[PDB]
Amino acid sequence: MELESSERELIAAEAQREVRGNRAAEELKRSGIGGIYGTLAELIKVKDEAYALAIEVALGNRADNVVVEDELVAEKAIKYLKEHKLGRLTFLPLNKIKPKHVDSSVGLPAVDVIEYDQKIENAVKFALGDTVIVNSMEEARPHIGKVRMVTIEGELYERSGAITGGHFRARGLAVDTTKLRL
């Protein structure tokens, strides 16, 4: 991230996602259930640090979704979660999950700035396939409700028209600007 504020935002966003979310995905890899690939967070790599915040924001909770071979794998995994009291997960079955697509030239498709195994493409395009990265809130307002957009600084415009904004980074304890304790 170029700006300090952007870097702080990214660290904060990442920290908050860790607190929400459920490490149960790890326990699933010891269930013996085959056909579980992992979370999108484990499967997607950002190609360019300039878009790290945009991709974190555009993935949002989808980062914690678990990619699986099919709906049978999902139902088996859900039984395991229930039996072992491991909370909840969202599963993305490769044969069912519907890819989304960009249908405009408003900006840079988010999928262009990530790397992932072609095998899980349906899951990746479901999460990020119609997301476009734009530079600011100004260059976004005309398309609210018609294009999914994320700004470089981390505002999110769902295609539905839902708008998400504000700082990820918290206020924290105040720190004297004066050097009162050298």
Add this chain to the structure above:
Amino acid sequence: MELESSERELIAAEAQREVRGNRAAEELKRSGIGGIYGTLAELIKVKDEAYALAIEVALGNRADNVVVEDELVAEKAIKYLKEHKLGRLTFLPLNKIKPKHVDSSVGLPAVDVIEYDQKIENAVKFALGDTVIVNSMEEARPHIGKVRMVTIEGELYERSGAITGGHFRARGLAVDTTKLRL
């Protein structure tokens, strides 16, 4: 909820949503910004306790979304959140937000079991407008990816094909079945 397990699930789901989520919506009502109606959680009432868990699950995080008059209200509110370091919110602008609709006879439309002010209908139908309530996971599998469904016991099938399941209720400390301390 008929079953004890369902009631426990509902309490747990509600408690978990409270911990996630941000009470910043309350601070917004003191910003002087007009055209803010409140969160969907404050605006929707369940008509029948039998569907309380289904509606909690089908709303999910949308329960914390803030309904506003238009995108101008959203952008003003986002500036306020940033200035006062109040974290993030998702806004639903009534003039932009896209209602969803049920296009099948698979089961009971979720909107049929709630009450809400007609004024915010676009926001409510955006969240719940294509959700159908079905009785179990069995009566659901054929339509994975073509109908948004929630089971009475709280599994969620997004129209995309994403499947969410598992207990909301936590294991907790073990409790002797033996009466060892009368």
